[PDB]
Amino acid sequence: EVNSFSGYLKLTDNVYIKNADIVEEAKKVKPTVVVNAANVYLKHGGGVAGALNKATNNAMQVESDDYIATNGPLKVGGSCVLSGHNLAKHCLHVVGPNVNKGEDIQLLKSAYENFNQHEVLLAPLLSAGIFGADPIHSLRVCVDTVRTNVYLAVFDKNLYDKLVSSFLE
Numbered sequence: 271e272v273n274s275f276s277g278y279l280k281l282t283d284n285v286y287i288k289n290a291d292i293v294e295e296a297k298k299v300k301p302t303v304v305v306n307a308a309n310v311y312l313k314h315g316g317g318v319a320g321a322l323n324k325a326t327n328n329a330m331q332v333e334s335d336d337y338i339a340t341n342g343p344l345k346v347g348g349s350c351v352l353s354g355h356n357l358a359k360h361c362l363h364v365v366g367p368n369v370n371k372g373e374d375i376q377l378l379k380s381a382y383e384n385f386n387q388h389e390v391l392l393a394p395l396l397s398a399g400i401f402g403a404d405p406i407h408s409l410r411v412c413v414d415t416v417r418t419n420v421y422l423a424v425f426d427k428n429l430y431d432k433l434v435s436s437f438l439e
């Protein structure tokens with residue numbers, strides 16, 4: 271079965287959300303596209319990106335280093351399409367702004383705009399966690415920006431509950 275997402279709550283006609291680890295979702299669903307919460311040099315050193323790379327047994331990091339060698343770093347708000355390895359057909363590496371490192375929160379709209387080149391995506395909540403954006407604001411930017419079908423996996427039940435309550439106000 272293709273893109274067999276299960277147990278998501280539909281927020282709008284094109285945005286769904288689940289309390290889940292994106293890595294476990296990707297292994298089960300094998301979506302057409304999994305989004306990585308990348309940085310501009312595609313160094314998957316921790317957090318979501320480190321977890322996705324570990325699930326590929328470091329194949330994602332080797333492929334990422336070869337992309338950077340030929341093409342140079344991404345821009346904040348930009349993306350590139352690379353292999354999905356065992357997690358998906360493709361991985362869309364998207365760079366959201368890291369507010370904790372002084373990057374402009376307005377670039378979060380540009381970051382989500384990359385999703386619109388793909389019909390169906392499994393994605394994390396961009397710029398949340400240690401990137402420092404307000405996660406309720408990130409969900410609002412996602413809902414207002416993404417027009418294709420996005421399945422958000424948020425690996426924290428406390429945050430999931432706050433996000434759903436924030437949406438349903």
Ligand SMILES: CC(C)[C@H](Nc1ncnc2[nH]c(-c3cnc(N)nc3)cc12)c1ccc2c(c1)S(=O)(=O)CCC2
Pocket residue numbers: 290291292293307316317318319321394395396397398399400401405423424425426429
């Ligand atoms: C807001 C968080 C709950 C959310 N976390 C997550 N959301 C979804 N699937 C996840 N798997 C893991 C995980 C981590 N480590 C191991 N070993 N396995 C899986 C984390 C996780 C999240 C959302 C976006 C960002 C981050 C974190 S970050 O990594 O701090 C910086 C980049 C942007």
